[PDB]
């Protein structure tokens, strides 16, 4: 019951990121980029996993089932509106972008705007605020 399992893992290495094993499974998945507190919860309810368990306590086969669901959300009845790379500007596919690929698309979008000298791209190039905030009195210590 409360005795530690013989196979308990303190770190789980998944998606080229570490997952703490002492943390609850719902909040341990959140450690990888592309999943938040709520994307994790629905993923491990599509896969029947006891919420009370911890990340170091669940066995390997049910772990690898989670990655398949996370990398392939649509094929397991995850709603379309629930993703973060919906209807992208290259292949028009609704996909969930995760730990390592999230930094690639974020970089691609920034240079996409800067390439053609759109106003939002210029402000990113100059390292300035892009959503219309007043720059007179705020965000100073970053800019010296």
């Amino acid at each position: 019951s409360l005795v530690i399992p013989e196979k308990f893992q303190h770190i789980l290495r998944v998606l080229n990121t570490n997952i703490d094993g002492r943390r609850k499974i719902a909040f341990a998945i959140t450690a990888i980029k592309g999943v938040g507190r709520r994307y994790a919860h629905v993923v491990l309810r599509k896969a029947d996993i006891d919420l009370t368990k911890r990340a170091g306590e669940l066995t390997e086969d049910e772990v690898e089932r989670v990655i398949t669901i996370m990398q392939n959300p649509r094929q397991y009845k995850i709603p379309d509106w629930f993703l973060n790379r919906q209807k992208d500007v290259k292949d028009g596919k609704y996909s969930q972008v995760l730990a390592n690929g999230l930094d690639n698309k974020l970089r691609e979008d920034l240079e996409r705007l800067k390439k053609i000298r759109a106003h939002r791209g210029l402000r990113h190039f100059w390292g300035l605020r892009v959503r219309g905030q007043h720059t007179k009195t705020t965000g100073r210590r970053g800019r010296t």
């Binding site: 019951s1 409360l2 005795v3 530690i4 399992p5 308990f8 002492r22 911890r54 306590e57």
Partner: protein, 75 residues
């Protein structure tokens, strides 16, 4: 300055460490048990709750913010 490293699940050494003298504490709460054993509060809440089920401690007051336990009457 000082950091706490509380284990989340009992090792064998600490599990019976609880089972022996904790049922003889005057005041049994998850707060006091957590730091006498260096354990998570959630583990303390679960560990204290299963001792009541067996019946080696008796509940004196139950509330959301605090749950309080003592030991059974002497003799």
């Amino acid at each position: 300055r000082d950091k706490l490293n509380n284990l989340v699940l009992f090792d064998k050494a600490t599990y019976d460490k609880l089972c022996k003298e904790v049922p003889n504490y005057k005041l049994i709460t998850p707060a006091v048990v957590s730091e006498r054993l260096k354990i998570r509060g959630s583990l303390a809440r679960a560990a204290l709750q299963e001792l009541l089920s067996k019946g080696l401690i008796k509940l004196v007051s139950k509330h959301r913010a605090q749950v309080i336990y003592t030991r059974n009457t002497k003799g």
